[PDB]
Amino acid sequence: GYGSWEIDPKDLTFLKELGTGQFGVVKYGKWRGQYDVAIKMIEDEFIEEAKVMMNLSHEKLVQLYGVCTKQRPIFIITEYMANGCLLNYLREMRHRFQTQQLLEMCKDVCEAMEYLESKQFLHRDLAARNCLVNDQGVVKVSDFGLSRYVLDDEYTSSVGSKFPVRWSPPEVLMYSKFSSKSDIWAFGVLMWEIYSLGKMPYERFTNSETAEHIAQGLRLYRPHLASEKVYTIMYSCWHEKADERPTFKILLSNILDVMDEE
């Protein structure tokens, strides 16, 4: 059993649909009439991913509340993030963000990633599409890709035509070399995403052309809203030599520094 994670489906109310795919559905709801939750309905892999989430718990990670593993379809119940997808949130020109708010959003993710790093857990799809924002503009990482078991397979999300090329270091594109230094690279690219208000990295290129140009040491430009100090930080993430890239411990201390200066 999952002991204290086993949720009684009776304590749930369904209210709004949030998203829907071939493989699953996420609905907004209430649990014991009190707390806001997202309810993700779907198999064995999906459960192995929930067990993972059971062992990860951080202020800036989307928290698992419980599971219902006794009726089909099986449920996962997580915390509810009222301002939705960070990518989409960034694209709303009506928010009229100040640089300070952008760096805070970098700090949030960064704190998340340092926990994961300290747990020797490698994320593999850190991007703006995979973060969420709560009612209070606080940003939180989804341990696993949101897409997983909604739109794509465990076989299809992050394989082939759905591979996160734009968030990937040269060693991954050429050699399938994953390590904590690839998560560092992608954090960098996500910083760029934030400072550019949700522009697609290498916005004028294909995945192939991005793969060639990365391999030739082409990098993303400093977004207008990004100061030199801030750009230095995300750039430091794209060193061609993986071991030359900072840790998340280092970077967070870098982000805190900028934040005190600016």
Ligand SMILES: COc1cc(Nc2ncc(F)c(Nc3ccc4c(n3)NC(=O)C(C)(C)O4)n2)cc(OC)c1OC
């Ligand atoms: C208030 O409006 C919105 C709220 C949320 N909040 C929220 N909080 C916690 C969650 F675990 C959560 N999960 C979730 C939701 C939807 C999904 C998926 N996951 N997965 C998917 O493959 C697609 C992406 C298909 O649909 N959403 C998300 C929104 O989109 C992410 C949104 O805009 C619809």
